[PDB]
Design a protein around this nucleic acid. Sequence first.
RNA 1: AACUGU
RNA 2: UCUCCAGGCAUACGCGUAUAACAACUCGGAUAACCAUUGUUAGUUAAUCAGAAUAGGCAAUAAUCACACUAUAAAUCACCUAUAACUUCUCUGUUAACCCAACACCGGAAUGCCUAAAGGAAAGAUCCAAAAAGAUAAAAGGAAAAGAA
RNA 3: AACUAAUCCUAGCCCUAGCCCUACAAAUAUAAUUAUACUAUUAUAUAAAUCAAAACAUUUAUAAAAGUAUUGGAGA
Lengths: 328, 96, 387, 172, 97, 176
Amino acid sequence: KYVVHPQISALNADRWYQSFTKTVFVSGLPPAPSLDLAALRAAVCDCILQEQVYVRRRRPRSLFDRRQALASSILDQVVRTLVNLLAPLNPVLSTAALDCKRSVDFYWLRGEERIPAGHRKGHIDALRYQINDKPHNQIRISKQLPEFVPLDYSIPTEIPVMKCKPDKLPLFRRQYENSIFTGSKTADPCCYGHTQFHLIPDRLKRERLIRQNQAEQVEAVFRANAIASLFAWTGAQAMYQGFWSEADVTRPFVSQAVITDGKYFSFFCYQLNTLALTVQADQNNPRKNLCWGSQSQPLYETVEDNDVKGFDDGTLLQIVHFLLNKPR
Amino acid sequence: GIYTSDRKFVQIKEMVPEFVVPDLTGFKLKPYVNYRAPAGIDTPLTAKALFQETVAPAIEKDFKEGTFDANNLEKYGFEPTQEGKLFQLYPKNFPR
Amino acid sequence: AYEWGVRSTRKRVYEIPGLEPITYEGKKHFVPWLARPIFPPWERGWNDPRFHRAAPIHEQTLYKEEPCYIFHQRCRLLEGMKQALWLTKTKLIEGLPKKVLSLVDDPANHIENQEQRVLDIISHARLWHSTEDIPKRETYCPLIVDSLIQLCKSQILKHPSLARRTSAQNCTLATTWNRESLLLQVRGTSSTILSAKDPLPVIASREEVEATRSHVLETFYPISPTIDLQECHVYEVKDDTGFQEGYPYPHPHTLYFLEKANLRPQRFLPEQLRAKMLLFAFANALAQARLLYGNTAKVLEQPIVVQSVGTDGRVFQFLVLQLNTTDLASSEGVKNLVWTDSDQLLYRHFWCRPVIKKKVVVEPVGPVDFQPETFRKFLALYLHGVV
Amino acid sequence: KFVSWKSRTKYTVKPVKNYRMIDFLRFRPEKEKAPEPFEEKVVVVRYDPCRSADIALVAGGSRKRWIIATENMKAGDTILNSNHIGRMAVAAQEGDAHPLGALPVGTLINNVESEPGRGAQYIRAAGTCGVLLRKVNGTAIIQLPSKRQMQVLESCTATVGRVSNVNHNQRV
Amino acid sequence: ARNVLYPLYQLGGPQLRVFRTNFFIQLVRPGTAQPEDTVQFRIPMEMTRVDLRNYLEQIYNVPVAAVRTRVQHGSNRRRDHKNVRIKKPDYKVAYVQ
Amino acid sequence: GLEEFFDDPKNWGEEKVKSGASWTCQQLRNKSNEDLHKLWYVLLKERNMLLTLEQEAKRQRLPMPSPERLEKVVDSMDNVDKVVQEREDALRLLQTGQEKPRPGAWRRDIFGRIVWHKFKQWPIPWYLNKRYNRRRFFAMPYVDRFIRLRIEKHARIEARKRSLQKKKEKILHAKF
RNA sequence: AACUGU
RNA sequence: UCUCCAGGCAUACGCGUAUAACAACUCGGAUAACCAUUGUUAGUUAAUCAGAAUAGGCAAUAAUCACACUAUAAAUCACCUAUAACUUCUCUGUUAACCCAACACCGGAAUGCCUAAAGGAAAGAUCCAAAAAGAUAAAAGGAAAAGAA
RNA sequence: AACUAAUCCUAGCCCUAGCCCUACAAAUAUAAUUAUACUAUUAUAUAAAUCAAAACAUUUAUAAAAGUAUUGGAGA
């Protein structure tokens, strides 16, 4: 089966993933307790200064992971403090489960092909795929999030269709275990989740992509990772609820995801309407999966001395909105 | 490039050739020549011919003027060593 | 047979005056019919790190004749507790501080369904967290501590004052001090150094601090105090609190040290862990004192209190250290006060899979002989200084 | 010219990738001790893959080192090592390393050396014991496992007792 | 440039510049199905994909997004009248987006 | 540009494309050093297009129009290189006197033959290069017998050559 | 010994 | 479409174009059909799959869900202290019904998954000879069931 | 006048004479033919026996004087 990388540099990678998943990605955010928003900036300002300028740690030997390591530390701290500061306002977070770099697995079949040669020449074989993703952080709750749009919602925007085979684009089929995983076992009470946090590597970062001339694909890299992770993660929960392709979900599965390149931050929302992507189960289904994503935005400008400059609350507001949101 | 420890490739920018492309705009020399064009009698350039064309006039003028000496042979174009030039005639250190 | 010399190694013409023998140097290669040339040292024209060799310690410019003994995580003291007390000039009181014990006596401190939540966390930390049937200590031991800290951190609802502290990530603690003219250095890392804007309350009164003068550090003839320490002749004098100057929370509340080695031979003994904690905890407190009071040697008027917790995921060790003196040159006088609670078992055993014996499920997927008291002692340390 | 598999820089008592580095020179004066009677603790009696007899881990003072185990050597035992040649015999316990001048006649010994400073080369196998046949002043007679009775100077070091697997010769 | 000697590099050495290029490449219609932006090239086996990227960008001023290259084994089954195996010249196929 | 890899759209489908004579050596010599470098790429660009067109013809199982065009370009390209090499050779000889761009010398192999050994640049010297010393540039004593055989083999070849001539002479008499 | 198309 | 059969799929090793399309119907398949033969052209796409700095100091305690519990058969670089370097994605492998057995051999061939959703056809035609081989059935009998010596 | 077949003349060789001789690129001794460091680097004994002595043992060749004297299990 094909091995799919949630973060990839392929052209139109978001389109390729959507075609396999039947996900429609509408630009922008999905249609829809005060905590001293200024206080978070000051607390976040300290957190950024804490790791960058105050904490003392052994320098990495590689000298190339230093930039990547620093971005992870600041993101983890902000998340840790944000959970504590938001805990009094939202008791749900106290009962919520936060996952640190745990893997999401999903396995599904889309498309078909006929064997052209070999002992099985002429036999029709379905295209097998797998996405394994390890979001930087993700929040898992025991209650489904409020739906962002009614089930069966139809919009003019259409799912992509891929001219070439998945093999033609770099994607290699390998035989190994098929896994569908929510980030935790079925035993874990938190079979739902609120938001997913992703950190893009340096190779896929904006600076390198612009140099590579794939500036337009920077959002595609953002889109591809979000769609892959959320669909793979969301589908697992519905499987944890007993729903599969022929037993498609009776209630849409909804959640959020945020992808940051270290400086810019992007916010993504996914709703899973169809578990049926096999030809048999998809033979009779008018539903489609809907994804809503926002463009990546900087969270702060620069770090000078012991005071960070240019912090953008607008990105922080979205995090505050996401953290405060709770099931209805 | 060079492969470091753990078999990890590290591209060496110096060892990666840079294609120096001539400016062909306005250049009258093309893939072919007319059958109209007569061929020239071959006169390959040699060390003696190059010396005669370039070095001989300078020495001849200086010798008549008397301002010739062994110390100033490099002035007429002698290179004691090829080191320091991007293109070294011997040992050859440049790609075509 | 004993071999003197490594067992691995075991199973005229030129002198003539007036002429020089010919050699194959002109050939540029060896030929049997020519003599071996004499080759001077080769000059590459540039310095290669791959072929560069670090000079011996004595040749270093930073070389110092006096030996500086450096203690790190892997260092294991032969005498364990006794050596640590002598090196740190501290007096030991068994059990946790009286205040810490009183913290959890308050019903509000106790977490809602504390035992059940801990039981669920232990099961999650051991089995549910990963897809592996039997996760190893290298994985679950870091996770269980993080989950317990989050469970304790969730108490911010009950006590908003807990927002005044934050936890770093494996900060570096280091100090250099002299004991009976012996140069001692402690180098520490790991932990999340939980730091608060205010120092932890002093556990012992000044009268008790003066009482420590009677206490005498135990000696262990014939072994030297510097045993098991890395003898260093090239070193720099440094004092490190784990944070650069200007850190909003200058006072460290607790210093955590974890041993996640799956194999018992790979796991340090509980006595050694506490000895490592003592030196590392002492260094962090000393760095604070030196920064506050300078490098002068004197009895501290205001003691500095720091805590340390050491656990391997099944056994938990709780350590509280109070720094009462900076005059550590002498072995007699005011001594630091340390409170120790050791061998606190969260659970005797955990089965990562359901144990079916004689077609009967004798053991569920959960801790065996679980002791909630250990978490309460852990909870007491975390809440101490706030409630 | 063959790359040695014993590539560890420093002598250690931990198993080495396992192989344990053994020391057959029993009396090496450890740090913080004079060349006089000093005592060591037999921490653990393990088995050496590269030697027939099982090795006893001897730890004394500031130094830890592996050694061959005698017949009755076990974990937790205290073993004495003395270089001093007293006018009267020094107290002898099974496995302790003393000069043959210290040892009394008739004691079973092992890990003996033919020449002073040679190091242990005989009675290092399982169940082998050398009898101190005779002792006079600075000379002693040791019956080696080769059946060769040899006379050596008192400077030679002898470890009392038979080697482990005492009934190896009695195997049927 | 192929069938030529390139200078050995040492630390601080000059940047490698090829003023005249002996590499000759052929654009070939895709035998397999490929995206339209993708272009196949038959190139000397000693050329690197970076060289092709530099080659197209500099000589032909062509912007390149991605490059994928494969080596096609030349059949040696064919034999001559003397029963001596004939080997098809191996060629490298480069997929350039 | 991509279009440069292909022929003129008008020329597509033509039996042949009108092209002139290839560059001669003397004309290239008359051209300047900078001009020669510029010309090589201009010559190369057509060659790649012709090679590009030829491969498509092979794919389509079709003939290449005006195949002489490729030969003419190669002749022009080859003539350029010798002219450039001649100028480099002349200057190299003057400044250094070396008849070869690369250092080399005559060395004896283990078979007793004398062959030109081109020296290789190494980061380390030969004496500290054990592998280079490991390389054998010396002939073994037993090669003397082979040397005698080589001389005998050469004599045998001449004897066989005379036999070859004799048989040819016979037929000359028979034919005439 | 029985058993059975031995 | 029907009748019937039930080890299938990956990697390793090996092979090296036997791969696929087209065109041939002579040779090769241990006979044809059909191609595995003959000729022509195509093919196997990788930052992710696979292949391709140094000197010192210093390490007691198996595993077995490792805890209890014992045991004998005895089973574990790191990290510190300094020195040195200072911004990287190329090259190569990737096809196939394939290999070792003189063969399209009958057997030999490492590992993981799984047992039909995967993989397959015993019938060149006609006749219904005898004899021969294998299998099934036995009126009555039971060596002309599995127990004893 | 038949099918299978057959037909042919040079490919070249052989012996003396004469004559001695002194005439692409790229990769390679590492694992030869592997574009740059590793690891130091290397042939050759009386010629024997077979054989003859009908076996086998000392022994057994390889211009005239003259196959003579001498030598030899005085025998080949």
